[PDB]
Design a protein around this ligand. Structure first.
Ligand SMILES: N[C@@H](CCC(=O)N[C@@H](CS)C(=O)NCC(=O)O)C(=O)O
Ligand SMILES: N[C@@H](CCC(=O)N[C@@H](CS)C(=O)NCC(=O)O)C(=O)O
Ligand SMILES: N[C@@H](CCC(=O)N[C@@H](CS)C(=O)NCC(=O)O)C(=O)O
Ligand SMILES: N[C@@H](CCC(=O)N[C@@H](CS)C(=O)NCC(=O)O)C(=O)O
Lengths: 220, 214, 217, 223
């Protein structure tokens, strides 16, 4: 089992999951090409533009999973696969539970990640220091209103997405939401959602993943 | 087995699959609220309290089947294909994994740009010079994923297992959004050939005929 | 002397209307929008905004355009102001201050009114605006017009025209930019004073004459 | 007396720049955008676009606005032309034809350049390509500016200024609308003559001074 991608990327999803498990694996750090001066260079560290990596993931993105006879792209698919084959109770007990996890993951990828990622970039870019950046964050937050309200309703009676227990479905949704976490007002209207995200991030494996992510070298 | 949503929506994905499997089901034609003069009498729509009781998110499609309410068009198709799809579903966990992967790729890399092309074409200034420029830009967002598909289809006729599966169906539908753009697939003959293999299927034609009559 | 480029079914309608009001002799050179022509460069293609012969007059490739000896003037609202001011009649400014006012109202028309109104016409032009989705798109544009229209409502509740209490090129310019969204029936329902003003402008013989010729193309 | 409403950090920069060129005495009345004030109708709110007292001057609630004896004039580009014509000397029109050209160039600036350029400015202020929609919006705006810029490149291939071979309010007006998209990378790469023209207008002492004022503008509260 090999996982390609640095902690400071969507590879954080499968890395967090593996941290939840007592499973050895090979971590192949691959950096985003834009963070490397001469990515094509014969002496450049393995990155998303490296020919050697494109032979693994033709799309040139991280993360990517490679096992004996299987190459899998898409962070949320990678985690679901790992959870169902190596994750024990973090994986689905039945096909309907698996379907629910796939559904929550697609919900996370299509309804939550885009607007949340937008908030993250406005913030990191420094754009949030202008009235325009602030207005833009509010517009992105409005795109998240329906998804967040639906989640608030769900967490009114449940502590987790599926089966009354933390599963890869929570991990997957929590990671997409992490992008918009830096905006204080985002979860203010949604206490139950904030409590759930706090519940997921208080886990030892998350803290460990985040500490490893912090210790990772930065590249611009 | 109940499917909520009109043919003229993402419900077309599970509707196409149900046609492929010739499976009986109860179709509940919920329409997008923005297509109704006054959603709040009006036809059952995404803003109807009666529908929000089914899917609080207020979107179609939605599947309901003996103790299971499932949303997300691409998840519904995989679920139906795995439980009653035969060869259209996965033959192993790894195939299932690949199908889920291709679906997320379809939803995150293909659908957003493809949807933008459609939205521009149906807009007031869609056939204007600005419109044509916007579509070309939206189309550029698809170069990376399309080129990647071109490389895959250069060796295989289908996404998984060398046979048509719910994986191809899912991707094929996300791409249909930008199909109205004439030059979209000119640079990608392999993708065009694959898409034609999917849309030449009787079930696809049947779904589109039902969509036209709607 | 005066040559006006552009068909009636375009912004050339503004100077054409004014010329009808003034009854001034001029040469009307029919130039149609390229997108309305098949092979804009064919030997039998009509003179259009993409024609090399026209780009020689207006490099920007747009209509209308005014051409006098020693002056090529683009921008429909500038053309009307120039024609009216030089003719020196009551449709033009009586002083520099009235001229400034007319220029201001013209920029107001060009920036606050034309964009949203044009948007409404385009929506109607496409398959339809009558559809719930089209109506919603039109409502969005009508909302961009609320502040401008409300301000016009306040102005017309005290005056019958924009400047000097008389019909001038300023009224003509504004009326033409607002005509784009006029097809949406409800557009001026909340603004009775504006609708009354628009009626006074469109009731003029010269306006009706311009429209008749427009319908003929 | 001549009153100019609006802060430097707004389109009031247009008449303020012109006024700096002429060194003409006038009363600057600071009026800030309402979205920059917590409680625009509050007792301690600075005069703003939502203030009832300002709406009495300009019903549209926008800056800048000019007020002279018996004249209230809105629209930044009409304001500059009016000042130029009445007290600008050579910065104003020498004849009716020149005046017509200045009005025409101002309308071209307001309709062909300002909208797309502003779109670029707003997206840049918010962070740039912070989403697929943002990158696209910038690319669309840049494409909308292609014809206008190319038309300008042709004009500046033989002239150093828009009208009369000298700096006039026409240049000032167009330059301010283009300033919005100035930072976009390579926007003017294909248009060196346009770029040199903008540099020509912006290297003037009055422009630099206006920008210095714009950068330092603010209210002092003694504590
Ligand atoms: N939808 C994918 C997206 C993966 C992705 O875009 N990854 C980024 C880093 S978070 C990347 O590899 N970008 C660098 C590049 O495209 O060159 C997934 O969730 O796995
Ligand atoms: N990611 C979802 C999106 C579903 C969706 O956005 N559906 C649209 C119709 S195609 C809708 O119900 N919108 C109507 C509304 O929000 O009122 C899926 O793929 O199922
Ligand atoms: N702001 C200008 C705009 C002129 C304009 O865009 N005209 C259109 C016709 S109404 C045109 O010539 N477009 C055809 C083309 O660009 O090829 C004015 O008001 O004169
Ligand atoms: N077309 C006008 C537009 C003026 C305008 O929209 N100004 C902005 C500030 S640059 C404004 O006052 N908006 C703030 C508001 O409406 O509250 C002109 O050029 O004078």
């Amino acid at each position: 089992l090999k996982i390609y991608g640095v902690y400071r990327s969507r590879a954080s999803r499968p890395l967090w999951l593996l941290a939840e498990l007592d499973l050895p694996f090979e971590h192949v750090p691959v950096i985003q090409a834009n963070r490397v001066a001469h990515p094509h260079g014969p002496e450049a560290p393995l990155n998303t533009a490296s020919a050697a990596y494109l032979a693994v993931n033709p799309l040139g993105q991280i993360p990517c999973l490679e096992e004996e006879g299987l190459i899998l792209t898409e962070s949320l698919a990678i985690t679901l696969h790992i959870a169902r084959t190596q994750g024990g109770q973090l994986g689905p007990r039945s096909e309907p539970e698996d379907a629910l996890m796939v559904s929550w993951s697609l919900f996370a990828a299509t309804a939550v990640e885009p607007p949340a990622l937008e908030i993250q970039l406005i913030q990191r870019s420094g754009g949030g220091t202008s009235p325009e950046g602030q207005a833009a964050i509010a517009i992105a937050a409005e795109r998240l209103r329906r998804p967040l309200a639906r989640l608030e309703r769900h967490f009114a009676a449940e502590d987790y997405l599926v089966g009354g227990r933390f599963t890869v479905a929570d991990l997957n949704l929590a990671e997409t939401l992490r992008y918009g976490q830096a905006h204080p007002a985002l979860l203010e209207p949604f206490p139950a959602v904030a409590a759930w995200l706090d519940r997921c991030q208080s886990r030892p494996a998350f803290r460990l993943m985040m500490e490893r992510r912090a210790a990772e070298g930065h590249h611009h």
